[PDB]
Amino acid sequence: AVPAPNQQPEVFCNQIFINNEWHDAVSRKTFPTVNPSTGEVICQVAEGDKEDVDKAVKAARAAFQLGSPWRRMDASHRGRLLNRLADLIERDRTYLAALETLDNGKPYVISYLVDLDMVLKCLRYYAGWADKYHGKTIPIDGDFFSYTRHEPVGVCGQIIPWNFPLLMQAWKLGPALATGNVVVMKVAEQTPLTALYVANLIKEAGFPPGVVNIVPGFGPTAGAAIASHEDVDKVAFTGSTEIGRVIQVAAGSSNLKRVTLELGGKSPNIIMSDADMDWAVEQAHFALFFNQGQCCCAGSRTFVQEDIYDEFVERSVARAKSRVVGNPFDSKTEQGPQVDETQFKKILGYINTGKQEGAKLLCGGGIAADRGYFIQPTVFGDVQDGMTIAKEEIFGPVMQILKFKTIEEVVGRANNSTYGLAAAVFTKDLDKANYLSQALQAGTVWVNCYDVFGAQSPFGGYKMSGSGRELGEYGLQAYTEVKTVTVKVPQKNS
Amino acid sequence: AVPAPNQQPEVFCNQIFINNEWHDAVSRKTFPTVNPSTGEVICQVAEGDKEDVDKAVKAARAAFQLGSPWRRMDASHRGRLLNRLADLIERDRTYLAALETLDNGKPYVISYLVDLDMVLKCLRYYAGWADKYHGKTIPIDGDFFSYTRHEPVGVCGQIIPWNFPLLMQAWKLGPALATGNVVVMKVAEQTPLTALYVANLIKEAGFPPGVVNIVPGFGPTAGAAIASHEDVDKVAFTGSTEIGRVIQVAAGSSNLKRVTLELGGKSPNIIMSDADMDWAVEQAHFALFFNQGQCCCAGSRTFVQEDIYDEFVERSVARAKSRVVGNPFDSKTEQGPQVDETQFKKILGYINTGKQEGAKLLCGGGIAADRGYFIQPTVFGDVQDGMTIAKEEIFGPVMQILKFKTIEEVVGRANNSTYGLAAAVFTKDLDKANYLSQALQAGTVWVNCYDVFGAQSPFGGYKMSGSGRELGEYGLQAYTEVKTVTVKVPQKNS
Amino acid sequence: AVPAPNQQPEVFCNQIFINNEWHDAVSRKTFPTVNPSTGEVICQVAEGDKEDVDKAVKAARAAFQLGSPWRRMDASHRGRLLNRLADLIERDRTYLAALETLDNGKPYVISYLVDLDMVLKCLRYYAGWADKYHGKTIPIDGDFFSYTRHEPVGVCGQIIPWNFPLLMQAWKLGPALATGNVVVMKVAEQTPLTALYVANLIKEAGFPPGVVNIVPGFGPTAGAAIASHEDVDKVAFTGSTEIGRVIQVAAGSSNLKRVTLELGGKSPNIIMSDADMDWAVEQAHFALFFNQGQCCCAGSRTFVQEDIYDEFVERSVARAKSRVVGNPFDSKTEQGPQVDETQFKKILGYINTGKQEGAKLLCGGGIAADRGYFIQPTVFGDVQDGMTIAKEEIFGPVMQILKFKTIEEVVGRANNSTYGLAAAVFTKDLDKANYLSQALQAGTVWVNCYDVFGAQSPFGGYKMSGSGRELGEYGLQAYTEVKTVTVKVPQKNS
């Protein structure tokens, strides 16, 4: 039961957020944000750059000073604030979901039932961690009392992507705020709206000025300014592998700020011959096509055992052909447009590459509508490991199905990648499930399911899919600076 | 690769161990310890009673005084001491294994390869815990600095059974010593020898006097004296459910000392129709017949799915018939005698009960030799839940095989018990394994295996099979007294 | 800032709470609950006995069945429910505070600003734990996958005292519910009202029927029925050392249910010569007189160094004399009446004992009013260790001041007790503070403060002050049943 959306949500926030106030870019420049469903401009947004980031960092540093309201605040109260923010987001759930769809393109039903639900669960999960991430009292040698204080890392720069606007903001703000840090966030230029509105809710919830600062703008400008800043203590980035390298290089070239990266992937979804056919087919479809295929851990490499290959392919093709593409605001729409023209073109280019390299086009392969950035659900059969569409992150509704014979074979082929964000295994066998989940080199291995995220469970990549983990208890590690205090005592006893 | 045993090991220790010295009982009384393989007396052992326990408790209390060598000793050094004890036990491995067999009756090969190996692995594991069981620094509300000190619980009374003499001693000493406690141990009257010799090694290792005290003697005397003592802070008991109740009542009646119990069981071993027949058969055999069937978590209720029942039974009977019973010192012996005459007769009474109640005797059922306490491997088929041999812990080589149809059925029947120490599931199906492991009400659930103990994994019972857990990190909880220190500070900051 | 109270709050709940419904006792019997400020009957309350407890246990067991709404509920949702209950309690904060004062006697201002605040903080803290009390994946030896499930302990019997009605209920419900257990609570016969109203809010919050059941009644009847019940998995008791013993004996005599106890104390408050005089005097007053002296960890033994003894006593006596005693609803009242006539008389008997044993009566010592159960703030000087008022828990506004010379002397004198609930040290010296906090044998050691409780910090006693800990992460241990699952895998790898 999803509330009727407002297909034309009003925009109340489109500037730079510093000290709980709205500012125009120092340059006074603005950039347009487009609605992918029509190709039309929604509104202008302040174009933050280096000078704006500088104002944001100073505000955050000021809010982080010893003795400030944010630093003195009870840990439990930080939890109270996070829950309040969640309550406020829930109050405006219908509006935010609509605005999310307008600027991103994903179906409103999904924005409401999935994106916003996950945002609420993430913030509420971390609210609980606020006063529970204990330090330790250590039984060190000699006559000493030794313990550790889990302090905030400090001024945290957070650069996020456009595929899950609200959710990426939550995954970042949740752990940072729970541990008492201050934030300078750089939202994606393609989807700045929903994040900016949430800043209004952050102010309404009671967060002190400067605790959360959002600077909308481009990457090489605002993004690089944050990564290279001399007064930013830590940076958390989610995006392409290419930019992740630039982020880490910026960190090492500047003040050696701490770094955590959540990059792309080319996750393998392995279907064994003993899998439940109907379930595997539907899950494999979801694994790749979810969120217009714009998911970091998308099952972009569907390995299917030769005994069930033919049947699996027929069913997969049928499902892809029945996948409804249209206006995201229509409750019947399963797939909306791609985020922008750049992604639109990049995906079409990959489809063309797939055709040239010898992959078998089974369905789709072209534009789905003359207005917007809609692409037909595309499925390639008989894909070989050496093919481009088998090695590069397409980030669109383009499925690759590969055939394999043995379990040893598939392990080597699945792990033969520079990526290692996620992986999946579909089987009814206990030993095969354990054998594969142990052998697969990925941050997350789903068994008989896919895209199962939980605020409780860690998520991150192996190899070049990133470093560090987000969500769960692990998501607090990167936002904590450990201090050891060793005190001389008259006589130590157990 | 088992060294030739000394079939008549010399006894060097047979008195009360207090303050790293050997004492006769105050009463000067002694009791005989018998060799179950011949029924002959090995030697006399000091019969400790209340007055002897009192001397041991005072010695322990003195060793636990603030400022004592044991209290001031670095946590890491306690670890060094435990590793030293392990090394000494390894030096005398061949001797201890032989002595273990002589007094307990289990096969020498098993004493050497299993019991002693596990003892070594238990002590070495806990040695590593000595300086790693951290306390916490807590982000409490207000201007305070709050933290916890994990202190030793104090004088720990440890009462152990006779089925695994050396191992039960290790499971008790390892965690207690790693956390800096002092001990007053009451070993079983049937097998006091090996534990007493280890006391010599404890002294040789460098442990301060009074840290470990051992009082051989009977239960209602020495055992009850420890459980009811006004100066014993904690008691850990391993034995029958009947005595466990007595221990807990004694604790409540005395000084409210902390209690942890490891009692009996009637563990169900579930064999699904899709299990590997050969494997399940051999494992089910081991699950019940191990250590003359004198194992707390023995799979005494073998549930077999109707479609594979007949074949499973035929193979089970054949294996039981081929099981070699004889002199424990003979390399070909799989099963030695029962611990003593009391157990010998108790088991025969159960076999008679099984015949009278209608269970089908498939093999064995009687005495295996005219000398010693040897009983033929016995297997009962078509056992029903209401039968005595299906509800009561037999503790002998008596196997119960029950038939079942559905998975929902077996769950209910397996959980329909006052016991809940362990359980096992044999299947190749992922979902069946996960379904059963979650549903079964047991402290340990083995999947496609049985009797897999690891110093790293906890062991304990649900319901009336005990309370608390031993082994792993959990094994330190009961030996730790938590102290909170909350300090007023000028101004708290995150 | 305190809202004007309704000095005559209406009672809406006075029956037995089972399956979210109100029931009369099977016997139809009722008992009167008195207002200690007037000695008049507030109303009648259903007198629950064994048969009523049986209905409660069965309902709880039913709500705990595998596949039930409570068992299947997401852990995070349990957190949501706990936060909802907290919100409902805050909505009715003014009403609950008034009702607390009416039935207990403590000052309304304190009920509102302290009791209810602490209740809200306790529930909100534990709501955050609901989905974060992780189990473990263990690197066990051999080819196995070993892990632990942290399951609910089951049907939890919770028996609470009358000194902090709402708070004791919160301390019990918070951790139990956070971990997925079901509850059968027995509230104190002297103060059943507030807890019963909270049951209504529990139903309003959405908790499934049978998750929380409250049975008002007496101890030897309803209380003993819970402790001795064959289907109660765990019992948590807070009360006298005398009844604690009875509970533990009942547990051992019945089904060996797990037990945690929170008993009395005779907590020492040590004031060193270098302490801040004004601060120590005020805190020492609060340490003992708080909540009409009806506090488990009351600083009933005030040790003062000889060089500051005379001045400390003069100031303490003056503070005691200025302490306003009267109607709890009057904002100027610091101290209300004692809970009932039984306590009233017991305290008067102790004051007489103090006079007879040679303690110097400095002020007070008699009845403060003709109506109600008011006792004058009483101070005894030159108290000796052997005196009864120095060894037994008075639980009234009776202060004992003892003189001491050295720091070594006070450690021995403070530790020479069967109690060990709490302790405190007042000093400006780093070494003295560390020396004492380590040496003191108490569950909580406050430094330069007293009665500082935090939902984040554990609380419990050493020796006969109880066993186990409440609050903090440690508060979840007793409500968790650990299950180890060890699965055989094809080939284990690190």
Added chain:
Amino acid sequence: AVPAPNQQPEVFCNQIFINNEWHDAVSRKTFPTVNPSTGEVICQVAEGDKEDVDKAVKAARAAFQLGSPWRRMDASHRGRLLNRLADLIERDRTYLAALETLDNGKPYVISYLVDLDMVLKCLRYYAGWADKYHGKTIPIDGDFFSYTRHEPVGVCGQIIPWNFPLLMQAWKLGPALATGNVVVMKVAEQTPLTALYVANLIKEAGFPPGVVNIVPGFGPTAGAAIASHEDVDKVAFTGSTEIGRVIQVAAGSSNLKRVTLELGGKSPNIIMSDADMDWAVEQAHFALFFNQGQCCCAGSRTFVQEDIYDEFVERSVARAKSRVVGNPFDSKTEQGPQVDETQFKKILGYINTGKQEGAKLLCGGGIAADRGYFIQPTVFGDVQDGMTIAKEEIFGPVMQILKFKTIEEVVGRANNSTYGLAAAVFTKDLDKANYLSQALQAGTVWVNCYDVFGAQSPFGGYKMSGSGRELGEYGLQAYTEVKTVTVKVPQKNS
């Protein structure tokens, strides 16, 4: 009790260690390692470069393959191997200490009693962690079973400095091996000898070929090769801030390997007016002069309160003048030479800068001997925050004494630095100690002591002194790659 040293220990190892075998550099080139005490060449050492690192990485990768001896080895056995290595290092303690002194220059007595003792304590500590760094079982939403596997991070490149050759090797090998990783270590060109010999002991201990590989050589060559390698999963570096940046940039430019850094410092040692004069003076001396002043956390900024400044300075100057400089093998020597000519000159240059900037030279200031790299213990008084010697890491026996008035003042001045490795506070006041320890922006804050390291307590820097922590449990974080396994189950229950 120090055994007489062999002042001319024979060198047995001076090549590249790959696959438990000794190899010459592919280029066949060698470099000389000098004895700083005489300026003479000890021996030639294989000069490893990129090609040799490539051989090392491939061997490490091979040893890390799924199914290899190192991967299948029980975690507990990895602990057994670490303890064995520790025992072997202890067997050869006298020899290793002598060789440490010969190549590094530090006093033999210190090498024996401190360096080697700490090495032994580090390895034995981590040996215990091998099978205790548990993963988690998470109570995720929905019908799923979610858990994490704590897997080894992989091929770990470890680059270490020359100030503590053996110890730096222990701090790196202990955690890496405890968690099942493989290593390619690059020891300092100035002190390669001792580490190479330890490789012989690693082979003798039973560690599989390729698990530990050591490549002696220069930084821009061998070091850079490791940091930029496409198949190295993680790099741990200990050295200058300058090279730390190069390492992080190389990591971002190559394969985005994980990075942890342990850089330099300019640690403030604060002496309050109420400190114990004698103690503070002796500890301030040790704080700076330890290990010829070649300590990362050296107290290079001694802040002394004005009221005790003159007395503190007089005593400090007297202690520095009495400090015995000479042959490190002579028992009376407190200070040996600097590690090499480059450091020698760098330190002399800093002393010159101190004289030019206006700092008051109180003692020393020049060369202590005509042979070797000996520098007189130098003390500068009246140092100002803006002076070069007050901002840059000198790494020599040059002490800076600065005067201050208030506690608020010293906090600001102590924190006004790009470094933040450690700090110290000397005071008898509880409040001041807690105020300062909380306020100071440093990885380790010592109270009434200094240079107190424990294998149990974390060590690392804030700001530019590094990132991540070493030692303690935290030391395992960087050598662990978290994997989440989420399995669909029929029906999830608590």
